[PDB]
């Protein structure tokens, strides 16, 4: 069922995010839109992820971030079983674009600029995306880029980022920073910068840079290119088991970025090196990335807006039962009802 009519009709499948997305014709504004159907109410985790996505996207307004135009759901909590989020329809995504063509450096440069511009806004709101990858970067023929799919987004929590070695993780494997496998829950802004570095590498060659086939193979791929971490980075590794693991490995030299990407712009590779830095404390931050020489032609902090109302506190949804989370989702979606 895709109960969005009679207002939204002529449905066609698009894809799946972290729910199902369809395109539809809006019979009011006479334009095609995208609609995501979410059915989360039987599981507490799905309720938490839905509430976060809706709360975050309703607070955000930025050119490089997908917005929420409308939310469809039943008029009462008792009748509400699905929630439909209506968003701008784009023409394609970076995953699909990279399957069909090789991007020129000036397209890579402009797309990277837009990714970082949107991420500056997200980070300024104390929010983490946590699942940046090509299929979540939407494009149109005018080359406007919009970040979508905030299903795994969280309010940043650097003081509670610590976890053990080889801790299970939800976000897309190929775009996970090395610390996810060593000591991190992915609650700091540096997690998103790593993913952006992976995306830049992928635009440079049309291939994922670290295509791990399984959880620990992901770290194998990363260390295979970055080489063995320094003593100083091992001194920042926190966990006994992570430190022991890394010390046990044979020494691996770093693979020069210009050997992997012999035709890439040297300034793109310098920025790539700084985003794909092993130690998250030494990894470049979003504002620094925007100020890097590779993006000098677009850099303009006066035209790179920040959020008016950041999320100052943890949402504290961990102990709320799915029944309470449904009440909160109902309240958060009320503004879109006819009354
Ligand atoms: C994760 C993904 C499935 O989520 C979305 C969310 C909002 C969206 N708006 N536009 C898209 C989108 C993404 C990829 N291709 C298209 N097009 C629409 C036009 O016909 C071709 C496919 C549209 C989209 C995807």
From Swiss-Prot:
The modification Phosphoserine is found at residues 12, 228, 230, 266. Its cofactor is Mg(2+). Residues 8-295 form the Protein kinase domain. It comes from the Eukaryota. It catalyses: L-seryl-[protein] + ATP = O-phospho-L-seryl-[protein] + ADP + H(+); L-threonyl-[protein] + ATP = O-phospho-L-threonyl-[protein] + ADP + H(+). Highest levels within the nervous system, expressed in different tissues, mostly in muscle, thymus and heart. It is an enzyme of class 2 (transferase). The modification Phosphotyrosine is found at residue 169. Changing residue 139 to A: Reduced affinity for DCC. Belongs to the protein kinase superfamily. CMGC Ser/Thr protein kinase family. MAP kinase subfamily. The TXY motif contains the threonine and tyrosine residues whose phosphorylation activates the MAP kinases. Binds both upstream activators and downstream substrates in multimolecular complexes. Interacts with ADAM15, ARHGEF2, DAPK1 (via death domain), HSF4, IER3, IPO7, MKNK2, MORG1, NISCH, PEA15, SGK1, and isoform 1 of NEK2. Interacts (via phosphorylated form) with TPR (via C-terminal region and phosphorylated form); the interaction requires dimerization of MAPK1/ERK2 and increases following EGF stimulation. Interacts with MAP2K1. Interacts with DUSP6. Interacts with ARRB2. This is Mitogen-activated protein kinase 1.
